[PDB]
Design a protein around this ligand. Structure first.
Ligand SMILES: Cc1n[nH]c2c1[C@](c1cc(N3CCCC3)cc(C(F)(F)F)c1)(C(C)C)C(C#N)=C(N)O2
Ligand SMILES: Cc1n[nH]c2c1[C@](c1cc(N3CCCC3)cc(C(F)(F)F)c1)(C(C)C)C(C#N)=C(N)O2
Lengths: 462, 462
């Protein structure tokens, strides 16, 4: 045994599963707004010998030696991260060690807040992320709500936007120490200037969690959260198109100067953010991930990536405009970003029904809660995203064509719904009924033929 | 841009960094007890298209669709995990999603304990891990000690062993809800049965954190903590020789049938452990890592891996014996596992000095506190481990040869100590002094010539 044998030779069972998954990704239409397709360059770094190195600590301040190269990789991943979002090294530092986006958020809270300190984030059904705080009536769901005290801020159910007025009303009562500006499922831009007004008034920190939009921010196709935010967290995946990992950007240097004291009052984020990641929360850095992130961060600095990002926005608008023109309602009436929230209630359907039908024809999207949701349990919408298929060289016409493929699925969903009682019965009907089955089997076959012809990033067979 | 370019062409700067690290690993003698060299098979899964899938939730209970293949991968990784450790699926379950070892531990505490509930782990300078609790005289350092209340237990400095008597004494007073059996720097086998008695007495959960020894446990070359623990956490790297990730094993089924009532009492770990990992702490699984772990767990079931693990013990013994023969002192007198704790104080040198000299001749080990010494004093010991070099096919003679090189390094360290006063003098004298610089260069070249000839697991170039 050398440990230099191929995966295909040494573990055929696993190799076939990778080939089955690679086939699935190629043949399908990926409309999940959080998914993308990572470059081969990044994945090569991700499966490198950098997996074999323990480098607890930070560049120049490690616990073990033999860390000369990984220091250069970490410092390069930092520099490239700052470059990718056009940040001055004197004003911003960055931590590249978080294992994902959820760890990066917990690290920020741990760094800046005492246990049980107060956090405000967009409510989960209103398009927020679990890690911004989430409790049900019976239990604390997110660990953010266990170790800290979270109160959600809501959407205006008329405009479908973030009610910035009610945020400011509740924030001055609840008195949070941190407010989170970021979203999982929201088609519009965030008023980071307004967020900072509220955070300034009530003496709170502003955290921008740009996970979903980080590529769009680097490409400068939408406005930057870095103009108004104290702290920015992100996934390195999603629109950035990197490996699964996380970043924490923080302000550094001088914040303010008081004329009375006659001196500079520095930002105190750096040491606390870094200490919270390590030694407080994480163990050994995943240097292979850090290197794969740095590969993607270089890619994001290029003209190529900007044109990809402009094409994401166009393809979202094209998917939005095409839905409107085929009789669909959109939450907030459209989009200014990579995704579209389709209210299926005004076309007499829900999200759960649409999801399972589309899935069966190799179209993967997720159900979504809309402001107009009459029922709290069964969600009445659909989140569709551009980034993935755009990375496969999809243009507007291709996106108009997937809308037509979707519409055919929705229209099967509307037909199966009217010949059905429950959501349990709705799934029994799709699998069993030959006329629905074969009409899906035909739609799948077309979707797969349409999808397969487009290029796929990464390796050829896995 | 296809995203199918090679890293070498795509990002030459990153490619040259990977190549330097590969050279450093190949030419070094890796004696860090936490290190290993991952198989190419495992690293191929790690840099696969599985990075592209979001599969929040668990197999058959996902939040998105299109997860049929990743479901099979996660279920396969679970089966192979239970098989590697010879566990009955009726009696044991396993979560394969933790992003690393430290996340796996935090998920356990989150799952079973309330904030501020009490944990006891082996003190950090006594050889426990940061995640078991650590506070300095003025600051909570580990997140375990921020969100929960940790009190350490200590070694008996006479024997270098865990003082099981004092643990039982202090546990009756402190009343921990959870006690952690597991170590980072400990040469001996833990008395899990005695840990169990103390836990049964004070009504505490026993957690076995077997990160360092997991491969030895899988190979059945040392006793298993699964015979006495409620929960077992581990890394998937270190002695298991996989990609960086974590596992949480837990009892399931019937705990004990109460004969007074008559009814069976169930274990209630499964749902709580799984909920803590997701949705409470983590987001999307790292399916690429999960698949790599599945490859490594498969490797760990084979005769090959048992022979590897026996060799790791023999090589550590051989290194211990070879150190004893050259007049070195070992903490606890020797070893029953993969590592050796050298006490350098008797020979008139410390761990900080030795570590840096050894680093400059391509031998990577780490300094370690000896029992009795306070943590504020410069550590007088050195931790050395067999697994990494054993994976490069080192045998007993080769480790004796390794001890020759270490001894030379120590002797160089002794000579530089007599010519300098402080640590910053010692460290700089190694770089600046001509005679010392030459002697190190000679030794380095001999170490590197020796190391390069042995095979290296992984890819050829990176
Ligand atoms: C898992 C998750 N993390 N962050 C999320 C989610 C979403 C989500 C959360 C949740 N919940 C988290 C715990 C229980 C509710 C449920 C659902 C679903 F699909 F069942 F409706 C969806 C979704 C992106 C998957 C979700 C929705 N809808 C939103 N808005 O943000
Ligand atoms: C980082 C870590 N996590 N878990 C550990 C450590 C060790 C460790 C912890 C620490 N500390 C963590 C916070 C400050 C002390 C310091 C040192 C050293 F090398 F500086 F002495 C070593 C070591 C394996 C690296 C360490 C030692 N010595 C032990 N016993 O276990």
């Amino acid at each position: 045994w050398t440990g230099q044998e191929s995966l295909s030779d040494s573990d055929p069972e696993m190799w076939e599963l990778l080939q089955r998954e690679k086939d699935r990704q190629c043949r399908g239409l990926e409309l999940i707004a959080s998914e993308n397709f990572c470059s081969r360059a990044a994945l090569e770094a991700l499966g490198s010998c950098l997996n074999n190195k323990y480098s607890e600590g930070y560049p120049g301040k490690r616990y073990y030696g033999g860390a000369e190269v990984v220091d250069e990789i970490e410092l390069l991943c930092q520099r490239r991260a700052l470059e990718a979002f056009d940040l001055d090294p004197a004003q911003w530092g960055v931590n590249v060690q978080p294992y994902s986006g959820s760890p990066a958020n917990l690290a920020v809270y741990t760094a800046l807040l005492q246990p049980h300190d107060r956090i405000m984030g967009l409510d989960l059904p209103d398009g927020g992320h679990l890690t911004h705080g989430y409790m049900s009536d019976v239990k604390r769901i997110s660990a953010t709500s266990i170790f800290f005290e979270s109160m959600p801020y809501k959407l205006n159910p008329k405009t479908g936007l973030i009610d910035y007025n009610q945020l400011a009303l509740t924030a001055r009562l609840f008195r949070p120490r941190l407010i989170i500006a970021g979203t999982s499922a929201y088609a519009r831009l965030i008023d980071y200037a307004r967020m900072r007004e509220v955070c300034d008034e009530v003496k709170a920190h502003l955290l921008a969690d740009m996970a979903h939009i980080s590529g769009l921010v680097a490409a400068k196709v939408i406005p930057s959260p870095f103009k108004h935010a104290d702290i920015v967290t992100t996934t390195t995946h999603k629109t950035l198109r990197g490996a699964r990992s996380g970043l924490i950007f923080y302000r550094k240097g001088v914040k303010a100067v008081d004329p009375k004291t006659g001196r500079e009052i520095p930002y105190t984020f750096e040491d606390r953010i870094n200490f919270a990641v390590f030694p407080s929360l994480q163990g050994g850095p995943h240097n292979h991930a850090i290197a794969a992130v740095a590969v993607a961060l270089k890619q994001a600095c290029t003209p190529m990536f900007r044109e990809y990002s402009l094409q994401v926005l166009k393809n979202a608008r094209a998917m939005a405009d095409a839905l409107l023109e085929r009789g669909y309602s959109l939450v907030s009436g459209g989009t200014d970003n990579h995704l579209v929230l389709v209210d299926l209630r005004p076309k007499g359907l829900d999200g759960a029904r649409a999801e399972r039908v589309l899935e069966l024809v190799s179209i993967t999207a997720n159900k979504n809660t809309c402001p107009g949701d009459r029922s709290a349990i069964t969600p009445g919408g659909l989140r569709l995203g551009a980034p993935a298929l755009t990375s496969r060289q999809f243009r507007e016409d291709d996106f108009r064509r997937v809308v037509d493929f979707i519409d055919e699925g929705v229209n099967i969903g509307l037909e199966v719904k009217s010949k059905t009682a429950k959501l349990q019965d709705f799934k029994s009907f799709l699998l069993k009924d030959s006329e629905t089955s074969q009409r899906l089997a035909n739609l799948r076959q077309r979707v797969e033929q349409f999808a397969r012809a487009f290029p796929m990033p990464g390796f050829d067979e896995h």
